[PDB]
Tab-separated table of C-alpha atoms and ligand atoms in Angstrom:
chain	number	residue	atom	x	y	z
A	1	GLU	CA	-23.792	6.810	18.553
A	2	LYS	CA	-25.043	6.573	14.974
A	3	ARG	CA	-21.961	8.427	13.750
A	4	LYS	CA	-19.830	5.995	15.755
A	5	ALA	CA	-21.722	3.148	14.078
A	6	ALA	CA	-20.976	4.643	10.663
A	7	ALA	CA	-17.295	4.966	11.557
A	8	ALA	CA	-17.198	1.326	12.677
A	9	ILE	CA	-18.891	0.152	9.479
A	10	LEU	CA	-16.499	2.143	7.286
A	11	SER	CA	-13.509	0.786	9.220
A	12	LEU	CA	-14.751	-2.762	8.618
A	13	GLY	CA	-15.147	-1.806	4.974
A	14	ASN	CA	-11.507	-0.712	4.878
A	15	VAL	CA	-10.461	-4.016	6.450
A	16	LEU	CA	-12.323	-5.808	3.663
A	17	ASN	CA	-10.756	-3.438	1.125
A	18	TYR	CA	-7.205	-4.396	2.034
A	19	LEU	CA	-8.180	-8.058	2.385
A	20	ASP	CA	-9.405	-7.963	-1.219
A	21	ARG	CA	-6.254	-6.108	-2.256
A	22	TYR	CA	-3.842	-8.721	-0.890
A	23	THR	CA	-5.868	-11.920	-1.369
A	24	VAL	CA	-4.222	-12.437	-4.772
A	25	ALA	CA	-0.795	-11.627	-3.336
A	26	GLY	CA	-1.357	-14.394	-0.802
A	27	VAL	CA	-1.996	-17.105	-3.397
A	28	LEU	CA	0.193	-15.922	-6.283
A	29	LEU	CA	1.915	-19.302	-6.633
A	30	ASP	CA	-1.325	-21.073	-7.520
A	31	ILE	CA	-2.283	-18.427	-10.080
A	32	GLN	CA	1.149	-18.780	-11.677
A	33	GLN	CA	0.941	-22.576	-11.768
A	34	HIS	CA	-2.663	-22.840	-12.975
A	35	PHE	CA	-2.530	-20.150	-15.647
A	36	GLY	CA	0.995	-21.156	-16.690
A	37	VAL	CA	2.284	-17.581	-16.868
A	38	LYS	CA	5.838	-16.667	-15.853
A	39	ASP	CA	6.847	-14.046	-13.272
A	40	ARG	CA	6.142	-11.185	-15.691
A	41	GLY	CA	2.407	-11.883	-15.726
A	42	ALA	CA	2.382	-12.283	-11.959
A	43	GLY	CA	3.852	-8.804	-11.640
A	44	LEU	CA	1.318	-7.522	-14.164
A	45	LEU	CA	-1.532	-8.765	-11.952
A	46	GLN	CA	-0.685	-6.001	-9.456
A	47	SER	CA	0.815	-3.362	-11.743
A	48	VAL	CA	-2.486	-3.139	-13.620
A	49	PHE	CA	-4.427	-2.921	-10.354
A	50	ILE	CA	-2.263	-0.099	-9.022
A	51	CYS	CA	-2.302	1.811	-12.319
A	52	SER	CA	-6.104	1.691	-12.391
A	53	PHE	CA	-6.221	2.792	-8.741
A	54	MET	CA	-3.826	5.642	-9.594
A	55	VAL	CA	-5.903	6.894	-12.506
A	56	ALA	CA	-9.240	6.491	-10.709
A	57	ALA	CA	-8.387	8.106	-7.362
A	58	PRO	CA	-8.506	11.773	-8.545
A	59	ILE	CA	-11.708	11.180	-10.518
A	60	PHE	CA	-13.543	9.852	-7.480
A	61	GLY	CA	-12.039	12.577	-5.317
A	62	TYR	CA	-13.687	15.026	-7.714
A	63	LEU	CA	-16.986	13.131	-7.971
A	64	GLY	CA	-17.343	12.913	-4.198
A	65	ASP	CA	-16.932	16.683	-4.021
A	66	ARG	CA	-19.429	17.370	-6.814
A	67	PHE	CA	-21.946	14.541	-6.267
A	68	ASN	CA	-23.309	12.214	-3.596
A	69	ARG	CA	-20.848	10.244	-1.473
A	70	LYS	CA	-22.815	7.425	0.168
A	71	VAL	CA	-24.231	6.193	-3.149
A	72	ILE	CA	-20.834	6.320	-4.866
A	73	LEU	CA	-19.085	4.531	-2.002
A	74	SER	CA	-21.711	1.781	-1.883
A	75	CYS	CA	-21.673	1.384	-5.662
A	76	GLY	CA	-17.908	0.991	-5.451
A	77	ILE	CA	-18.111	-1.688	-2.774
A	78	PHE	CA	-20.770	-3.778	-4.518
A	79	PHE	CA	-18.716	-3.237	-7.666
A	80	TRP	CA	-15.397	-4.644	-6.526
A	81	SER	CA	-16.991	-7.426	-4.475
A	82	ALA	CA	-19.029	-8.548	-7.491
A	83	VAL	CA	-15.998	-8.284	-9.778
A	84	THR	CA	-13.825	-10.328	-7.406
A	85	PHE	CA	-16.458	-13.054	-7.173
A	86	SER	CA	-16.894	-13.077	-10.953
A	87	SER	CA	-13.137	-13.202	-11.590
A	88	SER	CA	-12.911	-16.235	-9.334
A	89	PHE	CA	-14.792	-18.107	-12.103
A	90	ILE	CA	-12.429	-17.207	-14.976
A	91	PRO	CA	-11.289	-20.277	-16.972
A	92	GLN	CA	-7.670	-21.289	-17.537
A	93	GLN	CA	-7.514	-20.171	-21.179
A	94	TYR	CA	-8.042	-16.502	-20.241
A	95	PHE	CA	-5.469	-14.534	-18.244
A	96	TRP	CA	-6.013	-11.015	-19.554
A	97	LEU	CA	-9.545	-11.414	-18.212
A	98	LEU	CA	-8.103	-11.850	-14.722
A	99	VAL	CA	-5.836	-8.839	-15.265
A	100	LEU	CA	-8.815	-6.754	-16.414
A	101	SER	CA	-10.787	-7.857	-13.358
A	102	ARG	CA	-7.870	-6.702	-11.217
A	103	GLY	CA	-8.099	-3.339	-12.970
A	104	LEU	CA	-11.818	-3.003	-12.250
A	105	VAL	CA	-11.247	-3.975	-8.615
A	106	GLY	CA	-8.639	-1.226	-8.599
A	107	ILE	CA	-11.183	1.339	-9.783
A	108	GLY	CA	-13.708	0.316	-7.134
A	109	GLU	CA	-11.131	0.359	-4.348
A	110	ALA	CA	-9.983	3.772	-5.569
A	111	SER	CA	-13.503	5.113	-5.118
A	112	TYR	CA	-13.808	3.668	-1.619
A	113	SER	CA	-10.332	4.581	-0.356
A	114	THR	CA	-10.695	8.119	-1.696
A	115	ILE	CA	-14.198	8.901	-0.427
A	116	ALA	CA	-14.531	7.080	2.921
A	117	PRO	CA	-11.962	9.178	4.880
A	118	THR	CA	-13.835	12.342	3.873
A	119	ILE	CA	-17.062	10.944	5.343
A	120	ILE	CA	-15.278	9.900	8.529
A	121	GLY	CA	-13.736	13.350	8.882
A	122	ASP	CA	-17.025	15.143	8.238
A	123	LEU	CA	-18.978	13.061	10.759
A	124	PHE	CA	-16.873	13.867	13.821
A	125	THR	CA	-15.121	16.739	15.616
A	126	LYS	CA	-11.442	17.540	16.130
A	127	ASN	CA	-10.345	15.004	18.750
A	128	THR	CA	-13.062	12.521	17.806
A	129	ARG	CA	-12.203	12.817	14.111
A	130	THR	CA	-8.522	12.313	14.934
A	131	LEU	CA	-9.219	9.145	16.935
A	132	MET	CA	-11.655	7.755	14.366
A	133	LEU	CA	-9.273	8.408	11.472
A	134	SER	CA	-6.565	6.719	13.540
A	135	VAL	CA	-8.787	3.633	13.814
A	136	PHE	CA	-9.719	3.800	10.123
A	137	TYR	CA	-6.020	3.792	9.214
A	138	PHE	CA	-5.078	1.147	11.787
A	139	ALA	CA	-7.495	-1.003	9.801
A	140	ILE	CA	-4.804	-1.143	7.083
A	141	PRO	CA	-2.149	-3.563	8.451
A	142	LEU	CA	-4.890	-5.711	9.963
A	143	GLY	CA	-6.500	-5.794	6.533
A	144	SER	CA	-3.287	-6.874	4.815
A	145	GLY	CA	-2.448	-9.567	7.356
A	146	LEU	CA	-5.990	-10.913	7.252
A	147	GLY	CA	-5.785	-10.928	3.456
A	148	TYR	CA	-2.683	-13.114	3.489
A	149	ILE	CA	-4.122	-15.414	6.160
A	150	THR	CA	-7.494	-15.703	4.414
A	151	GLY	CA	-5.935	-16.522	1.055
A	152	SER	CA	-3.559	-19.184	2.329
A	153	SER	CA	-6.134	-20.643	4.732
A	154	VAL	CA	-9.013	-20.968	2.275
A	155	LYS	CA	-6.419	-22.573	0.008
A	156	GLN	CA	-5.729	-25.279	2.582
A	157	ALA	CA	-9.359	-25.704	3.648
A	158	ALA	CA	-11.295	-25.739	0.371
A	159	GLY	CA	-8.429	-27.132	-1.707
A	160	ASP	CA	-8.763	-24.781	-4.699
A	161	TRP	CA	-7.145	-21.402	-5.263
A	162	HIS	CA	-10.512	-20.269	-6.648
A	163	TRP	CA	-12.104	-20.226	-3.199
A	164	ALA	CA	-9.531	-17.697	-1.979
A	165	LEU	CA	-11.399	-15.085	-4.043
A	166	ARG	CA	-14.879	-16.316	-3.078
A	167	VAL	CA	-15.135	-15.727	0.689
A	168	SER	CA	-14.553	-11.956	0.740
A	169	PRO	CA	-17.295	-10.905	-1.757
A	170	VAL	CA	-20.107	-12.016	0.572
A	171	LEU	CA	-18.734	-9.858	3.371
A	172	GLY	CA	-18.290	-7.137	0.768
A	173	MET	CA	-21.978	-7.109	-0.111
A	174	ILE	CA	-22.968	-7.276	3.567
A	175	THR	CA	-20.728	-4.316	4.419
A	176	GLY	CA	-22.162	-2.504	1.414
A	177	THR	CA	-25.664	-2.981	2.792
A	178	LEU	CA	-24.589	-1.763	6.231
A	179	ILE	CA	-22.866	1.290	4.726
A	180	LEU	CA	-25.970	2.044	2.669
A	181	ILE	CA	-28.162	1.687	5.796
A	182	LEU	CA	-26.263	2.660	8.949
A	183	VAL	CA	-24.200	5.602	7.674
A	184	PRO	CA	-26.123	8.896	8.017
A	185	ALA	CA	-27.064	10.480	4.707
A	186	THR	CA	-24.190	12.575	3.394
A	187	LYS	CA	-24.543	16.340	3.790
A	188	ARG	CA	-22.369	19.060	2.280
A	189	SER	CA	-6.741	26.962	-10.028
A	190	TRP	CA	-4.735	23.757	-9.749
A	191	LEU	CA	-2.071	25.286	-12.016
A	192	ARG	CA	-0.901	27.845	-9.454
A	193	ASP	CA	-0.966	25.282	-6.646
A	194	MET	CA	1.044	22.790	-8.698
A	195	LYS	CA	3.616	25.437	-9.627
A	196	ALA	CA	3.971	26.510	-5.994
A	197	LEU	CA	4.316	22.886	-4.878
A	198	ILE	CA	6.992	21.988	-7.425
A	199	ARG	CA	8.737	25.159	-6.260
A	200	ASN	CA	8.446	23.824	-2.684
A	201	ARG	CA	11.593	21.757	-2.178
A	202	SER	CA	10.733	19.991	1.085
A	203	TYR	CA	7.449	18.716	-0.334
A	204	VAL	CA	9.139	17.569	-3.557
A	205	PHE	CA	11.853	15.582	-1.809
A	206	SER	CA	9.418	14.095	0.720
A	207	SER	CA	7.180	13.027	-2.180
A	208	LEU	CA	10.101	11.305	-3.897
A	209	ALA	CA	11.010	9.582	-0.619
A	210	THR	CA	7.417	8.366	-0.269
A	211	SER	CA	7.633	7.097	-3.852
A	212	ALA	CA	10.680	5.020	-2.916
A	213	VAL	CA	8.863	3.702	0.170
A	214	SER	CA	5.908	2.684	-2.002
A	215	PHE	CA	8.245	0.968	-4.476
A	216	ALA	CA	9.758	-1.144	-1.710
A	217	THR	CA	6.411	-1.836	-0.035
A	218	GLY	CA	4.651	-3.001	-3.185
A	219	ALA	CA	7.489	-5.121	-4.539
A	220	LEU	CA	8.294	-6.877	-1.265
A	221	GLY	CA	4.730	-7.238	-0.012
A	222	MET	CA	3.849	-9.035	-3.186
A	223	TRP	CA	6.895	-11.176	-3.940
A	224	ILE	CA	8.078	-12.202	-0.440
A	225	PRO	CA	5.536	-15.035	0.142
A	226	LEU	CA	6.388	-16.636	-3.203
A	227	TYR	CA	10.114	-16.077	-2.641
A	228	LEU	CA	9.942	-17.715	0.792
A	229	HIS	CA	8.072	-20.667	-0.693
A	230	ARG	CA	10.793	-21.043	-3.319
A	231	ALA	CA	13.280	-20.909	-0.446
A	232	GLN	CA	11.483	-23.808	1.212
A	233	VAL	CA	11.474	-25.726	-2.084
A	234	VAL	CA	15.212	-25.291	-2.641
A	235	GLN	CA	16.220	-25.869	0.986
A	236	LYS	CA	14.008	-28.976	1.318
A	237	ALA	CA	1.315	-23.069	3.467
A	238	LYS	CA	2.641	-21.618	6.721
A	239	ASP	CA	4.790	-19.070	4.860
A	240	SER	CA	1.907	-16.751	3.990
A	241	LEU	CA	0.225	-17.229	7.380
A	242	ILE	CA	3.343	-16.256	9.318
A	243	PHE	CA	3.987	-13.419	6.868
A	244	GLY	CA	0.462	-12.121	7.449
A	245	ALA	CA	0.881	-12.186	11.220
A	246	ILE	CA	4.268	-10.472	10.840
A	247	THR	CA	2.704	-7.806	8.613
A	248	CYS	CA	-0.057	-7.160	11.153
A	249	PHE	CA	2.379	-6.756	14.044
A	250	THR	CA	4.852	-4.666	12.040
A	251	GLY	CA	2.148	-2.341	10.757
A	252	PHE	CA	0.881	-1.886	14.299
A	253	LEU	CA	4.345	-1.377	15.821
A	254	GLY	CA	6.104	0.721	13.175
A	255	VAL	CA	3.981	3.783	13.877
A	256	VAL	CA	4.666	3.336	17.600
A	257	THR	CA	8.416	3.152	16.978
A	258	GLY	CA	8.214	6.231	14.770
A	259	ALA	CA	6.273	8.151	17.408
A	260	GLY	CA	8.803	7.205	20.073
A	261	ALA	CA	11.733	8.248	17.889
A	262	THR	CA	10.024	11.543	17.022
A	263	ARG	CA	9.322	12.206	20.706
A	264	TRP	CA	12.898	11.473	21.767
A	265	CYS	CA	14.393	13.459	18.878
A	266	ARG	CA	12.172	16.563	18.880
A	267	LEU	CA	13.551	17.657	22.257
A	268	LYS	CA	16.966	18.081	20.593
A	269	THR	CA	16.268	19.513	17.115
A	270	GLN	CA	13.558	20.802	14.789
A	271	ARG	CA	14.386	18.387	11.934
A	272	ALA	CA	13.509	15.348	14.052
A	273	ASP	CA	10.817	14.098	11.670
A	274	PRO	CA	12.870	13.810	8.433
A	275	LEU	CA	16.050	12.663	10.199
A	276	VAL	CA	14.023	9.950	11.947
A	277	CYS	CA	12.529	8.963	8.594
A	278	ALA	CA	16.002	8.756	7.050
A	279	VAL	CA	17.493	6.654	9.854
A	280	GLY	CA	14.489	4.335	9.816
A	281	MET	CA	14.819	3.900	6.062
A	282	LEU	CA	18.534	3.108	6.279
A	283	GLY	CA	17.892	0.506	8.976
A	284	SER	CA	15.056	-1.028	6.967
A	285	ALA	CA	17.292	-1.142	3.894
A	286	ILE	CA	20.017	-2.981	5.810
A	287	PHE	CA	17.599	-5.550	7.205
A	288	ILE	CA	15.875	-6.020	3.837
A	289	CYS	CA	19.323	-6.703	2.387
A	290	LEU	CA	19.827	-9.301	5.108
A	291	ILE	CA	16.472	-10.978	4.343
A	292	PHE	CA	17.861	-12.758	1.281
A	293	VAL	CA	21.144	-13.822	2.889
A	294	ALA	CA	19.172	-15.226	5.822
A	295	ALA	CA	16.541	-16.988	3.697
A	296	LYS	CA	19.330	-18.680	1.748
A	297	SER	CA	20.264	-20.661	4.885
A	298	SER	CA	17.330	-20.722	7.331
A	299	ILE	CA	13.797	-19.355	7.254
A	300	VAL	CA	13.455	-18.288	10.909
A	301	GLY	CA	16.154	-15.684	10.368
A	302	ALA	CA	14.254	-14.590	7.270
A	303	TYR	CA	11.106	-14.062	9.337
A	304	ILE	CA	13.035	-12.084	11.966
A	305	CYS	CA	14.624	-9.916	9.275
A	306	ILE	CA	11.178	-9.323	7.757
A	307	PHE	CA	9.939	-8.342	11.228
A	308	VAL	CA	12.704	-5.784	11.772
A	309	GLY	CA	12.739	-4.452	8.208
A	310	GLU	CA	8.985	-3.914	8.141
A	311	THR	CA	9.084	-2.305	11.590
A	312	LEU	CA	11.697	0.222	10.476
A	313	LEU	CA	10.174	0.674	6.997
A	314	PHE	CA	6.573	1.250	8.111
A	315	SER	CA	7.440	3.971	10.642
A	316	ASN	CA	7.556	6.753	8.027
A	317	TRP	CA	3.838	7.183	7.349
A	318	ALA	CA	2.523	9.439	10.112
A	319	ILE	CA	5.841	11.290	10.044
A	320	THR	CA	5.588	11.886	6.293
A	321	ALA	CA	2.043	13.154	6.822
A	322	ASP	CA	3.322	15.533	9.512
A	323	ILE	CA	6.099	16.801	7.229
A	324	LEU	CA	3.619	17.470	4.431
A	325	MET	CA	1.275	19.227	6.863
A	326	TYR	CA	4.076	21.460	8.157
A	327	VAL	CA	5.690	22.497	4.880
A	328	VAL	CA	2.450	23.026	2.912
A	329	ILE	CA	0.266	25.990	3.896
A	330	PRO	CA	-3.388	25.194	4.742
A	331	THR	CA	-4.839	26.396	1.435
A	332	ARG	CA	-2.933	23.676	-0.460
A	333	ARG	CA	-3.119	20.567	1.725
A	334	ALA	CA	-5.644	19.118	-0.738
A	335	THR	CA	-3.576	19.533	-3.902
A	336	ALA	CA	-0.406	18.564	-2.029
A	337	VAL	CA	-1.911	15.299	-0.792
A	338	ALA	CA	-3.458	14.474	-4.174
A	339	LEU	CA	-0.243	15.081	-6.111
A	340	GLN	CA	1.862	13.276	-3.495
A	341	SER	CA	-0.360	10.193	-3.666
A	342	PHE	CA	-0.308	10.238	-7.469
A	343	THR	CA	3.486	10.621	-7.595
A	344	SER	CA	4.052	7.916	-4.983
A	345	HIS	CA	1.846	5.487	-6.896
A	346	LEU	CA	3.461	6.417	-10.224
A	347	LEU	CA	7.015	5.810	-9.041
A	348	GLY	CA	6.275	2.948	-6.639
A	349	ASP	CA	3.448	0.434	-6.532
A	350	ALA	CA	2.552	0.919	-10.205
A	351	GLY	CA	5.863	-0.185	-11.674
A	352	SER	CA	7.598	-2.140	-8.925
A	353	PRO	CA	5.837	-5.548	-9.200
A	354	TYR	CA	6.087	-5.703	-12.985
A	355	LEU	CA	9.677	-4.447	-12.904
A	356	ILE	CA	10.679	-7.117	-10.382
A	357	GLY	CA	8.898	-9.722	-12.490
A	358	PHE	CA	10.633	-8.574	-15.669
A	359	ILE	CA	14.100	-8.510	-14.097
A	360	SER	CA	13.510	-11.956	-12.593
A	361	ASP	CA	12.366	-13.255	-15.974
A	362	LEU	CA	15.491	-11.926	-17.702
A	363	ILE	CA	17.821	-13.332	-15.041
A	364	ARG	CA	16.111	-16.719	-15.277
A	365	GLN	CA	16.257	-16.604	-19.084
A	366	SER	CA	20.027	-16.141	-18.861
A	367	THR	CA	20.521	-19.604	-17.328
A	368	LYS	CA	18.846	-22.993	-17.714
A	369	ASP	CA	15.705	-23.265	-15.599
A	370	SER	CA	15.842	-25.057	-12.244
A	371	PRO	CA	14.307	-24.501	-8.787
A	372	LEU	CA	17.657	-23.301	-7.446
A	373	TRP	CA	17.900	-20.819	-10.300
A	374	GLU	CA	14.293	-19.743	-9.744
A	375	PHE	CA	15.356	-18.941	-6.182
A	376	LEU	CA	18.454	-17.108	-7.386
A	377	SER	CA	16.619	-15.114	-10.054
A	378	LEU	CA	13.863	-13.998	-7.687
A	379	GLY	CA	16.407	-13.058	-5.029
A	380	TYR	CA	18.514	-11.043	-7.454
A	381	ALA	CA	15.435	-9.297	-8.848
A	382	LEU	CA	14.220	-8.369	-5.362
A	383	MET	CA	17.715	-7.141	-4.457
A	384	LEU	CA	16.850	-3.983	-6.414
A	385	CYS	CA	14.442	-2.898	-3.668
A	386	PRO	CA	17.027	-2.251	-0.889
A	387	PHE	CA	18.835	0.095	-3.271
A	388	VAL	CA	15.548	1.950	-3.759
A	389	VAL	CA	15.124	2.140	0.019
A	390	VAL	CA	18.615	3.634	0.339
A	391	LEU	CA	17.752	6.148	-2.388
A	392	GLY	CA	14.579	7.067	-0.515
A	393	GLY	CA	16.611	7.566	2.641
A	394	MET	CA	18.838	9.937	0.697
A	395	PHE	CA	15.737	11.835	-0.418
A	396	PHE	CA	14.504	12.050	3.179
A	397	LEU	CA	17.861	13.516	4.205
A	398	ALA	CA	17.515	16.015	1.357
A	399	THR	CA	14.110	16.916	2.808
A	400	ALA	CA	15.721	17.379	6.225
A	401	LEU	CA	18.126	19.832	4.608
A	402	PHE	CA	15.287	22.251	3.714
A	403	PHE	CA	12.785	21.327	6.443
A	404	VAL	CA	13.577	24.238	8.780
A	405	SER	CA	13.588	26.821	5.989
A	406	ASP	CA	10.323	25.622	4.474
A	407	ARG	CA	8.547	25.294	7.825
A	408	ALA	CA	9.575	28.874	8.592
A	409	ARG	CA	8.345	30.047	5.185
A	410	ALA	CA	5.018	28.247	5.639
A	411	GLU	CA	4.506	29.834	9.059
A	412	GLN	CA	5.409	33.266	7.671
A	413	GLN	CA	2.938	32.876	4.805
A	414	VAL	CA	0.055	31.559	6.916
A	415	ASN	CA	0.551	34.242	9.585
A	416	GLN	CA	-0.046	36.879	6.889
B	501	LIG	C1	8.698	-6.786	3.680
B	501	LIG	C2	7.775	-5.624	3.323
B	501	LIG	C3	6.376	-6.173	3.061
B	501	LIG	C4	5.406	-5.028	2.792
B	501	LIG	C5	4.041	-5.412	3.354
B	501	LIG	C6	2.952	-5.107	2.332
B	501	LIG	C7	1.683	-4.701	3.070
B	501	LIG	C8	1.521	-3.188	2.963
B	501	LIG	C9	0.909	-2.654	4.253
B	501	LIG	C10	1.045	-1.135	4.286
B	501	LIG	C11	1.361	-0.698	5.715
B	501	LIG	C12	1.190	0.813	5.835
B	501	LIG	C13	1.057	1.186	7.309
B	501	LIG	C14	0.502	2.603	7.416
B	501	LIG	C15	0.118	3.072	8.583
B	501	LIG	C16	-0.438	4.489	8.696
B	501	LIG	O1	-0.938	4.907	7.456
B	501	LIG	C17	-1.558	4.505	9.731
B	501	LIG	N1	-1.616	3.215	10.397
B	501	LIG	C18	-1.287	5.599	10.760
B	501	LIG	O2	-1.572	6.848	10.197
B	501	LIG	P1	-2.085	8.059	11.188
B	501	LIG	O3	-3.329	7.622	11.922
B	501	LIG	O4	-1.007	8.385	12.193
B	501	LIG	O5	-2.393	9.286	10.364
């Protein structure tokens, strides 16, 4: 029971983690208006966070292995909660202070999101650990949707964008106390692995496909609420609320759709997983293309297109994990996962928000400023993402090309 209590507390911690991650994304319009910065700074607010998370994830993966885990995880949670609450008090004259606070929150969330799954895995046994990790990861879309809803509801209730960053820190400290109390006390080269992995074609192409998925996910999940609000302005705070509910349902249903497609395809071929990923990505790309055309005219069609595009886009998470598990022999599933996460962050979430902001800024600078042209510039900048989704689908098909050969090679090597 105590181990189940620890798993529940860490899952609630993950919910709070993603809520903190997307609270700013919920209320980006107010930050832009108050601080006066253009779209480039708004993109920077998440590019810096993701870069810090990128750089800090391997370090905390190493420190958890070579030091205590409960203390580090709790220090991380009282670190990012305190930093979020402090950053809520930043004056208007300072913006780089807010960006730096986003970076520090990124470091803390890196520590938590890198160490907590190891604790959850160590606590339980095979089937129990599988179920508990499934819950811990189902905490993700719920966390993101609750982050959007919390941001754009504390906005409307309190009346200041500041209070959007003030409600989550208290729960952060409380969950830190519960982690530091309820969780049972924790109990216990790369060169060759990297060369073998870069020689492994299926892993390389699946990693690039995951990078494209992360690019699309970061860029859209940040800029869609603001883009929909600009759509409402041109067409003449429910946008973020409905987007949060849509994100919750799509995160919960995309894995189910992927599992169904994998089940119905595996009876007919061995490359069911990458082919299913590729078809899902192509469908998501088409519907993400249609998001902008729909939102030009009516917003209900935009919400439906978001629903379908997220459902098809979010399906390729468990399937990507399965592909990586199959192609990579057991002795390298640690280095493979670490390098895949680093590469996905490097080519996706790290650069996508700032790149979309920069392209939007250039397009807007071309023409005289107006709300209609703000709409058009943001739409054209976000139009880059469907092309990235199509490219990722191409990379998934390239993975499918070598999937059989590399699965056979992995089985041959492990059977030795
Ligand atoms: C229009 C696009 C907007 C993008 C929305 C931004 C919010 C990002 C939310 C990220 C959703 C990722 C969903 C991942 C699910 C899996 O990791 C687990 N639920 C299942 O893994 P398992 O248990 O099977 O191992």
